[PDB]
Amino acid sequence: MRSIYLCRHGESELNLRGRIGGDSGLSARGKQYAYALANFIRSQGISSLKVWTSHMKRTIQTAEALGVPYEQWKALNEIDAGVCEEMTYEEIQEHYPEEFALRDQDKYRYRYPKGESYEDLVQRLEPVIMELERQENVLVICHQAVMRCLLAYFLDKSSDELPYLKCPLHTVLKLTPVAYGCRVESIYLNV
Amino acid sequence: MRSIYLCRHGESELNLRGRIGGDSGLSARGKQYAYALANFIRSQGISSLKVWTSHMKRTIQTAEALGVPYEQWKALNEIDAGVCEEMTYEEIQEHYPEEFALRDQDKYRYRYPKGESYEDLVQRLEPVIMELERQENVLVICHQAVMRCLLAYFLDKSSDELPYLKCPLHTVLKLTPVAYGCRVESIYLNV
Numbered sequence: 119m120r121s122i123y124l125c126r127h128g129e130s131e132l133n134l135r136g137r138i139g140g141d142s143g144l145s146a147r148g149k150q151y152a153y154a155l156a157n158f159i160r161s162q163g164i165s166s167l168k169v170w171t172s173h174m175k176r177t178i179q180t181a182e183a184l185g186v187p188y189e190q191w192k193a194l195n196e197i198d199a200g201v202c203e204e205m206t207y208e209e210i211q212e213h214y215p216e217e218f219a220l221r222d223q224d225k226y227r228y229r230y231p232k233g234e235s236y237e238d239l240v241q242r243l244e245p246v247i248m249e250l251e252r253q254e255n256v257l258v259i260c261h262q263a264v265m266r267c268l269l270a271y272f273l274d275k276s277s278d279e280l281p282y283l284k285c286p287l288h289t290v291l292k293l294t295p296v297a298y299g300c301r302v303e304s305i306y307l308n309v
Numbered sequence: 310m311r312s313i314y315l316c317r318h319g320e321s322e323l324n325l326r327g328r329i330g331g332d333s334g335l336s337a338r339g340k341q342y343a344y345a346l347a348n349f350i351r352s353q354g355i356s357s358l359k360v361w362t363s364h365m366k367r368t369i370q371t372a373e374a375l376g377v378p379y380e381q382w383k384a385l386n387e388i389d390a391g392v393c394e395e396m397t398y399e400e401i402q403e404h405y406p407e408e409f410a411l412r413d414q415d416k417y418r419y420r421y422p423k424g425e426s427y428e429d430l431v432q433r434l435e436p437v438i439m440e441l442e443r444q445e446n447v448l449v450i451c452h453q454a455v456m457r458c459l460l461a462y463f464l465d466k467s468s469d470e471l472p473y474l475k476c477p478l479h480t481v482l483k484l485t486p487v488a489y490g491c492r493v494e495s496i497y498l499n500v
């Protein structure tokens with residue numbers, strides 16, 4: 119039996135402002151989740167856990183509170199919002215009214231202007247899944263769209279439903295693959 | 310056609326120090342804006358302009374440089390920062406870390422400890438708007454939070470966006486209500 123702790127980075131300065139994308143750092147409370155996740159990891163008493171992050175500051179900074187070392191993966195970088203990077207839902211609807219509607223039609227195949235889609239991201243995550251599905255104890259601190267693609271894989275979900283998976287902030291999903299697919303144990307850390 | 314000159318008081322001693330609230334007087338440059346606004350008002354050649362201010366020194370002193378008389382309105386007083394009055398962004402984050410985060414969540418409904426919110430202020434400004442929207446030429450020399458509530462009203466803005474309106478110092482917004490809402494002509498006085 120092995121576990122795969124899929125969690126998202128601690129709340130970022132941009133998450134607080136309701137904005138998407140960017141390479142922002144952790145907010146004061148984001149930092150708190152880092153330490154909160156720290157104590158949690160210690161409470162779990164795992165045998166040689168491998169911590170994987172992305173190149174974004176938010177994930178790195180979350181990891182830096184665990185003391186132990188981490189391996190950075192560019193494939194684990196958040197979906198590129200393209201021309202809509204660092205924008206709010208409103209700004210997107212205002213400056214990109216067409217793209218917004220077009221996106222509500224098909225969420226899986228929607229690709230932002232100058233960016234990628236869940237589909238593109240799926241391709242990008244192929245190597246990550248391959249290495250992840252043959253490792254022992256792993257804590258993958260990533261992002262919302264990435265976490266959904268990975269989660270969906272281990273829970274065999276449709277490309278349709280994939281973009282709607284519950285991947286809130288400060289919540290760690292303890293995945294334990296078993297004979298029929300996988301077992302999820304949701305852990306929420308209040309900070 | 311009528312105009313509504315919405316401008317903020319001239320820079321105060323506390324504005325220079327990066328502090329909020331208080332009942333401070335105009336800095337030497339604040340005074341300069343008073344005279345600068347004076348010459349501007351004379352350049353505009355208006356017919357019987359009514360000058361409305363608040364009870365705070367900064368607005369009164371700005372008006373006192375126009376020569377003409379002014380009517381003071383307590384409803385036009387700046388939002389009460391409560392327990393955070395006369396503090397800097399840092400001091401607030403230091404001594405009131407929780408309130409600061411709590412405020413970043415909802416800006417419209419955030420109420421300072423022992424003070425008011427944009428929401429409270431909206432209620433307070435009801436009578437001012439009612440009298441303002443039935444007058445002819447008016448110059449309302451007020452403050453940042455007040456100016457946003459008034460501006461937002463005449464430009465029909467959401468309670469969401471309201472707290473983010475551009476209301477810098479030394480800038481006078483010439484509002485001219487027209488059939489579809491209102492017309493704004495931004496005037497900046499360099500001093």
Ligand SMILES: O=P(O)(O)C[C@@H]1O[C@H](COP(=O)(O)O)[C@@H](O)[C@@H]1O
Pocket residue numbers: 126127133137138139196260261262263281
């Ligand atoms: O983990 P993040 O990089 O912070 C991602 C966050 O998750 C959301 C993306 O997921 P949705 O498909 O639900 O919008 C973004 O709006 C937001 O930036």
Ligand SMILES: O=P(O)(O)C[C@@H]1O[C@H](COP(=O)(O)O)[C@@H](O)[C@@H]1O
Pocket residue numbers: 317318324328329330387451452453454472
């Ligand atoms: O017109 P004031 O009374 O000087 C107001 C000024 O405007 C700011 C309030 O507006 P924000 O919501 O942008 O902080 C204050 O920090 C500052 O004292």
